[PDB]
Structure formats: structure tokens, C-alpha cells
Amino acid sequence: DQENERNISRLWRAFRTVKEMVKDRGYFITQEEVELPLEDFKAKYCDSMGRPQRKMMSFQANPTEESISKFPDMGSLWVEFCDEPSVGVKTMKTFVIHIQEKNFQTGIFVYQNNITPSAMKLVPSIPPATIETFNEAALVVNITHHELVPKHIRLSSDEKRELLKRYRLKESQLPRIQRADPVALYLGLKRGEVVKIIRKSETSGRYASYRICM
Amino acid sequence: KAIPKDQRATTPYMTKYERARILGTRALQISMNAPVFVDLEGETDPLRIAMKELAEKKIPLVIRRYLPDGSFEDWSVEELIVDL
């Protein structure tokens, strides 16, 4: 077996998460396209010996018809992995463009050990379109499943303009969340997007809270 | 900005701080030879007369309730319920 039977077992879960996250973001996916057990995983994205073929995992995803009700212009998403333990600023033009053409809006890329600082400085160069960068090791476990972290929710630019008007609040008087905050990334917030934090309470079962972004 | 007597949203009840201050305020005046709107059952202590005016809800005052953003709501000692 050796110590590779474990380097896949990890890529696996790492994958799983990516999925879950893409569905909670507001996209289409089945629970069956997630619970994809280990066994049946191997015999799909592997080659001969029994090793992982990442460039073979990449894929596309589309909004659920529900996400169209609250968010109209919610574009399409695309995720991508790499067989390159050390990705560079060359293979980036590969991705960056692949999207600028097809014309999506959401680009998720998964690096292994890291990306080249020459590369990363190419994401904010093709607006509207947006891109995000995730390390494998941080997606092995879904942080949102942790006893502590309660569930959050994105608020429509409508649902928001309301939260203010009902509490007679100015944007700045609102409790904030970090642009880098773990969960903020799990949903991909944008400077200005508000989140509704709904948690449990020993004083009253449920407490509704809000976090704007900065 | 102000707010219509309708669309009112505050607490129908008098806050301790309010009542506390009303009586005080009212005493102060009564103690200053202001007119007393109740029959003095023989009382002679202002804060005590004030307690009386406040139970026959005959105190001519209005508690303006400023909100965090500046707007306010106006309630009368008349309206406001006094549990406490």
C-alpha cells in the first residue's frame, strides 16, 4: 500500500468539500454527486497503477432554479484542479483565458503546494468575471461542519436594502465579517454583501444576527 | 424627523427611567408652586402629590422618545400604561 493510499484519501475528501461548498453557494448538485464513496472514486479519476489524475476532475456547475428567484444575474461557476504540485504563472493564462472566452463569472482554482506570486497577480485583471484561490489542505475538512461555526446566509441586494430600512441603520453601524474570514470565503462574499448569522441560544433557542463585509 | 401617532412602534408601557423622571420632574414643578391638577387628599410632599397626579393620570406631560437615528415618538403620561 505504502503512504500514497493516504495521499488520495485526502485529495478525495478535499474534493467532497469543494462540491458541498459549490452547492451551498447556491448551485446545482445532488447529494448523490457528493456522498460519492471512496471505492467508486478511485476507478474514475485514476490511470493505471492507481494514482490520481487531477486534470481529469475539473468540472462545471450551474445555478439551481431557486438561486434565480433571489439572485437574478448569478452567473455560472467552474472549478479546476491540477496535477502540478508546483503551479506557475504560465499555466495560469490557461485558466484565466478559458473563462474570459466561455464567459462565466465564477472561477475556482485548486492549487496543491502553492502558486507563483507572478501568477496570482492576474486574477483582478478581467472584470466583471471573478476568481478565487484555494489550497487543498484547507478544503480537506469543511469548516462549516464544525460544532461551533453556525450557519450563515447571503442576502440579496434586496434583502439587504431592507435590513437597513427596518433597523434604521447606516451601513457602518453594522457588525462586520472579514473579507478573508474563513466562512466568508466558503460562500465568496464581496465587499458590501451582508450575511445573516442564525445561531442557537441558551437564552432563546434561535438568535438572528447580521454581518456586513469589509 | 418625527413620527406619526400611528406607525408608532415603541413600548406601550412606561419605562422605569421615564416614570422615575416624570415624578421627579413633576415634583420639582409642584415644589415650585406650579398648579396641582388633583385634589390634595391633604398631601403636602411634592413627590407625593406627584405620585398622586400620576395615578389619576393627570400629568400634562409628554415623553419624547428619541431613536438611535434621531427620529422620535411622542407618548403622553395619559396613554402609557403603568405596571411597574
Curated annotation (Swiss-Prot), chain A:
Q: Mention one GO molecular function.
A: DNA-directed RNA polymerase activity
Q: Which UniProt keywords apply?
A: DNA-binding, DNA-directed RNA polymerase, Nucleus, Ribosome biogenesis, Transcription
- GO:BP terms for this protein? nucleolar large rRNA transcription by RNA polymerase I; ribosome biogenesis; RNA-templated transcription; termination of RNA polymerase I transcription; termination of RNA polymerase III transcription; transcription by RNA polymerase I; transcription by RNA polymerase II; transcription by RNA polymerase III
The answer to whether the entry has keyword Zinc is: no
Q: Which InterPro entries match?
A: Arch_Rpo5/euc_Rpb5, RNA_pol_Rpb5_N, RNA_pol_Rpb5_N_sf, RNA_pol_subH/Rpb5_C, RNA_pol_subH/Rpb5_CS, RPB5-like_sf
Q: HAMAP family in the record, alphabetically?
A: RNApol_Rpo5_RPB5 (MF_00025)
**Its quaternary structure?**
Component of the RNA polymerase I (Pol I), RNA polymerase II (Pol II) and RNA polymerase III (Pol III) complexes. Component of the RNA polymerase I (Pol I) complex consisting of 14 subunits: RPA135, RPA190, RPC40, RPA14, RPB5, RPO26, RPA43, RPB8, RPA12, RPB10, RPC19, RPC10, RPA49 and RPA34. The complex is composed of a horseshoe-shaped core containing ten subunits (RPA135, RPA190, RPB5, RPO26, RPB8, RPB10, RPC10, RPA12, RPC19 and RPC40) where RPA135 and RPA190 form the DNA-binding cleft.
What does it do? Answer: DNA-dependent RNA polymerases catalyze the transcription of DNA into RNA using the four ribonucleoside triphosphates as substrates. Common component of RNA polymerases I, II and III which synthesize ribosomal RNA precursors, mRNA precursors and many functional non-coding RNAs, and small RNAs, such as 5S rRNA and tRNAs, respectively. Pol II is the central component of the basal RNA polymerase II transcription machinery. RNA polymerase complexes are composed of mobile elements that move relative to each other.
**What name does UniProt use for this protein?**
DNA-directed RNA polymerases I, II, and III subunit RPABC1
| Organism listed in the record | Saccharomyces cerevisiae (strain ATCC 204508 / S288c) (Baker's yeast)
Q: Highest lineage ranks of the organism?
A: Eukaryota, Fungi, Dikarya, Ascomycota, Saccharomycotina
Curated annotation (Swiss-Prot), chain B:
Which family, according to the similarity comment? Belongs to the archaeal Rpo6/eukaryotic RPB6 RNA polymerase subunit family.
Q: What range does the record give for the signal peptide?
A: none
Q: Gene name?
A: RPO26
Q: What are the start and end residues of every segment in region (Leucine-zipper)?
A: 40-61
Keyword presence, Zinc: no
| From-to range in the entire protein, with total length | 72 to 155 of 155
Note the subunit structure. Answer: Component of the RNA polymerase I (Pol I), RNA polymerase II (Pol II) and RNA polymerase III (Pol III) complexes. Component of the RNA polymerase I (Pol I) complex consisting of 14 subunits: RPA135, RPA190, RPC40, RPA14, RPB5, RPO26, RPA43, RPB8, RPA12, RPB10, RPC19, RPC10, RPA49 and RPA34. The complex is composed of a horseshoe-shaped core containing ten subunits (RPA135, RPA190, RPB5, RPO26, RPB8, RPB10, RPC10, RPA12, RPC19 and RPC40) where RPA135 and RPA190 form the DNA-binding cleft.
Superkingdom, taxonomy of origin: Eukaryota
Question: Which Gene Ontology terms cover its molecular function?
Answer: DNA binding; DNA-directed RNA polymerase activity
What this chain does, per the record? DNA-dependent RNA polymerases catalyze the transcription of DNA into RNA using the four ribonucleoside triphosphates as substrates. Common component of RNA polymerases I, II and III which synthesize ribosomal RNA precursors, mRNA precursors and many functional non-coding RNAs, and small RNAs, such as 5S rRNA and tRNAs, respectively. Pol II is the central component of the basal RNA polymerase II transcription machinery. RNA polymerases are composed of mobile elements that move relative to each other.
Identification of the protein by name: DNA-directed RNA polymerases I, II, and III subunit RPABC2
Query: What UniProt keywords are attached to this protein's entry?
Result: Cytoplasm, DNA-directed RNA polymerase, Nucleus, Phosphoprotein, Ribosome biogenesis, Transcription
Q: Which organism is it from?
A: Saccharomyces cerevisiae (strain ATCC 204508 / S288c) (Baker's yeast)
Intracellular or extracellular location(s)? Cytoplasm; Nucleus
Establish whether keyword Phosphoprotein is in the entry: yes
For this record, an example GO cellular component is:
RNA polymerase I complex
What does the miscellaneous comment read? Present with 6090 molecules/cell in log phase SD medium.
- What processes in GO biological process is this protein linked to? nucleolar large rRNA transcription by RNA polymerase I; ribosome biogenesis; RNA-templated transcription; termination of RNA polymerase I transcription; termination of RNA polymerase III transcription; transcription by RNA polymerase I; transcription by RNA polymerase II; transcription by RNA polymerase III
